Amino acid sequence: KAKVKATLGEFDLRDYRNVEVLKRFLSETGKILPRRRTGLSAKEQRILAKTIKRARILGLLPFTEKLVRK
Amino acid sequence: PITKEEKQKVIQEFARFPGDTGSTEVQVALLTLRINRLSEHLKVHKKDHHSHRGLLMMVGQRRRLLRYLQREDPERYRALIEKLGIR
């Protein structure tokens, strides 16, 4: 169970239009992952959160998903 | 807000000599600019309180600096009060 930041290159944390990368920080559900899972900084995570929320309002990322299997 | 430009014009106005920044004069003038900005902002937004405390504080400072000028050089003081339209 590696960390999200671990596998990735240089990427803008303020860029809400980039779904490809932002989707990696979400849950099985729509949830924004804990820092333990994102391996991010305090500041970093604080920025990512607002950027993701922007993308949600913007229609790009989900607010919620449905749990499969179960 | 207050642009760097506006600030600068205020200082090169109230400077006692080229390169003067922190004079009693320049300080009072700057404060005055900030005061007027705030009061104009508090005419609308009357319910902004925390800001208003900010203003109280500014006014207090301005008055103390003026009190100092008054004590030290009454002429510079009279001149300032006339130039700025205060007290």
Binding site: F11, D12, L13, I57, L58, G59, L60 | -
Partner: protein, 101 residues
């Protein structure tokens, strides 16, 4: 005055005539509020993560402007008045803070 980014998501059902019309109105309103246009990216048709106005898709216009700051909210109000425009988000620009440098 200040530097912003205009996000616009409009109806994916549009043909070219009507698309160009809505765009013509976006432009008109932009230059009408005093907004200068630095850069524009048209991403277009995209799959939304959730349905918007009952549509699974949306068409994206992205602008970057310099406009008078006292006029921004009026500008956005203007863009929203349109029927065909289902999302408007205007954001102050920011330096590209990044990780994994």
């Amino acid at each position: 005055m200040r530097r912003y980014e205009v996000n616009i998501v409009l109806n994916p059902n549009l043909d070219q005539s009507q698309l160009a019309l809505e765009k013509e109105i976006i432009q008109r309103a932009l230059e009408n509020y005093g907004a200068r246009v630095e850069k524009v990216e048209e991403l277009g048709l995209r799959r939304l993560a959730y349905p918007i106005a009952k549509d699974p898709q949306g068409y994206f216009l992205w602008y970057q402007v310099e406009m008078p700051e006292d006029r921004v909210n009026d500008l956005a109000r203007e863009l929203r008045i349109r029927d065909n425009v289902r999302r408007v988000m205007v954001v102050k620009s920011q330096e590209p803070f990044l990780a994994n440098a």
